Design a protein around this ligand. Sequence first.
Ligand SMILES: Nc1ncnc2c1ncn2[C@@H]1O[C@H](CO)[C@@H](OP(=O)(O)OC[C@@H]2O[C@H](n3cnc4c(N)ncnc43)[C@H]3OP(=O)(O)O[C@H]32)[C@H]1O
Ligand SMILES: Nc1ncnc2c1ncn2[C@@H]1O[C@H](CO)[C@@H](OP(=O)(O)OC[C@@H]2O[C@H](n3cnc4c(N)ncnc43)[C@H]3OP(=O)(O)O[C@H]32)[C@H]1O
Lengths: 430, 431
Amino acid sequence: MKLLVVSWGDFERWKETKYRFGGETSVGPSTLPILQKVIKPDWTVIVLSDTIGKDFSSVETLREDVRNRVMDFLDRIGAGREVDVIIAPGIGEFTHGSFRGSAMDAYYYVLHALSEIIPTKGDLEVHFDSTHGLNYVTLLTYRALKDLLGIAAVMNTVTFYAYNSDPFVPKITKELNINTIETTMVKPTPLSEPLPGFDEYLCPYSMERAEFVRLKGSLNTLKNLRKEKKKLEAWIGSLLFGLPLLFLEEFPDIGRLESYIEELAETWGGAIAVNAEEKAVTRRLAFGSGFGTLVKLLFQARITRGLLVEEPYSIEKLYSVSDRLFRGSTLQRVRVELGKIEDKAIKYARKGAFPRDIPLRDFLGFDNREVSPRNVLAAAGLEANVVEVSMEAWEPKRPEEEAGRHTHLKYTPVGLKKVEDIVSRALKES
Amino acid sequence: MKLLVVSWGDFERWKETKYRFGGETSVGPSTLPILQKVIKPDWTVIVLSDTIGKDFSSVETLREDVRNRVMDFLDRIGAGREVDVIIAPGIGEFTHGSFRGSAMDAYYYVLHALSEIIPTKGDLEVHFDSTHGLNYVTLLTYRALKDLLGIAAVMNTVTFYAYNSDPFVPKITKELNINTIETTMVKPTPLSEPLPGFDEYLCPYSMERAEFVRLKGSLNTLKNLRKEKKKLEAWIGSLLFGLPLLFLEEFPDIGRLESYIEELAETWGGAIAVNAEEKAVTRRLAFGSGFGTLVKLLFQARITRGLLVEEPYSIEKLYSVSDRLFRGSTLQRVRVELGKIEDKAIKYARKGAFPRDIPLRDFLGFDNREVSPRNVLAAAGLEANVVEVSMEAWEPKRPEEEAGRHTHLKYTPVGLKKVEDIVSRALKESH
Ligand SMILES: Nc1ncnc2c1ncn2[C@@H]1O[C@H](CO)[C@@H](OP(=O)(O)OC[C@@H]2O[C@H](n3cnc4c(N)ncnc43)[C@H]3OP(=O)(O)O[C@H]32)[C@H]1O
Ligand SMILES: Nc1ncnc2c1ncn2[C@@H]1O[C@H](CO)[C@@H](OP(=O)(O)OC[C@@H]2O[C@H](n3cnc4c(N)ncnc43)[C@H]3OP(=O)(O)O[C@H]32)[C@H]1O
């Protein structure tokens, strides 16, 4: 999949020029047609600021004014069908209107929009045009894109190319090159941040705290999240620290994460006040870092959801999951720990012994019944005192080959809680 | 240390306005005085393009024209003098002249210049203003700054703030707010690139093949690096994979690294052709990714050099090094491995046994003598067939607290070579 993302300011102001890119030539006010010709993207995303809007009756007459103006220009320059337009929350005081709120809302809003567009299956080739962006919207768009691609790179190959034309001097410029300014193979970066305290999903920008405290208290999301926070952190830690059984046992409910994000996104949009007379938009709520963390969390669940199976979890399944998810010394520790349990399973199978629900410590022949954070993290979450082993009997013929399919691991109810506390806490000390 | 970094375009085109920042206001053509007033940085860096330069006699005349004009603009606005000015190789055809070369030269040059300015000891609070920046210069400066700060964050607490003024509307703007657009605790991200093939330090932009081949074959940097490449990669993987003994034993020679980067940077500078007549700069050589890898490698060696010590390396030293470099399950797996070697050291010390030059295999009482990649990486480099143990004889009084200090690890000659192959190959196979 080839994805073209561009960052746009006030496109109506741009002058007709000739662009050079990919041995080709184009005349027009925008880089977009020549980028689309040379790259042949499967999909185009335009990120714009709502600050170019002039119809001030409401949020919807605002978005409609901006959206119609973008499509007029796209048809005029011949941009095409296969385009999403993200109308991001901008700020400032202009001829036609006044826009007030957190400058950082643009990051959370673009992060939320890109998370619903970037495919969560297969390899990505991502192209990014910074030539026409407002500096802060361009920089926040770049960051939002790179944050999501890093998570995508855990499961798939992701490459990223950035472009910028030469600088335009009004009136004297005829021709501009489109330069390549970045070529990267994006590195796998699982989510490495805990969920924050409950004052950090939505923040008052200009809302009186009576209204804020009442609003915060009326949200299902904040209540349900308090309940689930530690299980979700256990899951984030599972990918960051290399704990493949915890990855499967704590795999999050995607429908619940979606509703959390939707409730927060609509509470934010709900607090947007438009004064038709003053031509003034006030985003009385600001997104917090927690909204960002929930969006990255749902994206990561979507990217890895194809690994999930129903219990029970075999050694063979723990190996295959680990091979997709983990790298470096973390993969190799997983393989050592699974290999020791497998080696033992083989010895039992060779004796026609098929123990069930046996504490891992007895399975391995240990005698330190205390659960240590050190050993939970260092042994890939397969600590002797929190895991139960079951071998489902079969007729062994080549036991070396077979034990792995037929040996299952799970956390004991007590063990799972102690692992959740350990992993959650390790995530917060970072 | 508070470091302020500002991305600037053509400062002579900017108009007088009002800015507000930290309940202050300021009048002038630039955010810089009000940023300096509120933040009170210990040091300021200005990044701009040399494509503002007007004097084409020579490379240095051009940089001199740009530096003199920035220093005059600083006087006019009242910024003062405690500033580095990074004059990045920019690109484009302008009325006053033409600037040709790879657009990615600006990333490598700014990475190199920041790598000599960002303090390599202590915490860092870094402030970044994108307000007045060229889009491409701002993106490449932002990336170079984040890349070096991720390395510094391995040793030190690094916080990052980014700012951007409201957009300026030529005849409507009364006053511009300076917005906060990022507030970050920077995450430790050690170098995770191998050194590339030898075509990727300097690349021809507009340089003929006879010249390039002769130039490439004349560089002692490329010959030396072919030789030290695997040991340098073994060091990079030591931080990435959690191998504290390898981190000490392969700690690079900072003198040689400076010389590699100085030679590549001087060859790049010497390939810049300035035609005074038709006012054209051509940067005949482009920087390759290998140049950036070397700069990041040197910067990581500067950041971690406080941990290095003389050769006897104790379990106690390996714990303290690992506590600064490693996190999460990597850190815990180092402590599991050191702990096992430590417990046997305690048992031997209690009985008056002080084994010298003993294979770790014998020390732990093992025995295959085959070295596996899996076991080297999973046991934090401390594989029983590649490590030698020596305990100093001492009179144990509190052996459980004393054994760690007295118990020394080192790779055997053969063992180190095997570990180098394993770590170099694991670095390359995740790129
Ligand atoms: N067809 C188009 N019509 C209008 N703009 C276009 C078009 N195609 C691309 N652009 C770019 O879109 C942004 C909006 O106009 C501009 O890029 P940005 O990076 O925001 O600004 C570059 C300007 O470079 C100007 N400076 C002109 N000389 C040079 C120079 N020789 N060394 C460095 N900067 C130069 C600067 O004056 P300053 O600092 O006040 O504004 C910058 C344009 O270059
Ligand atoms: N004292 C100063 N003198 C001159 N410039 C200053 C000064 N202080 C700050 N600046 C900024 O420095 C860059 C060069 O002048 C400018 O920032 P940049 O982010 O490059 O672009 C501003 C322009 O805002 C334009 N657009 C104007 N309306 C709106 C609008 N209502 N919704 C979204 N964008 C708007 C954008 O369209 P586009 O890409 O053609 O040009 C940009 C200025 O905002």
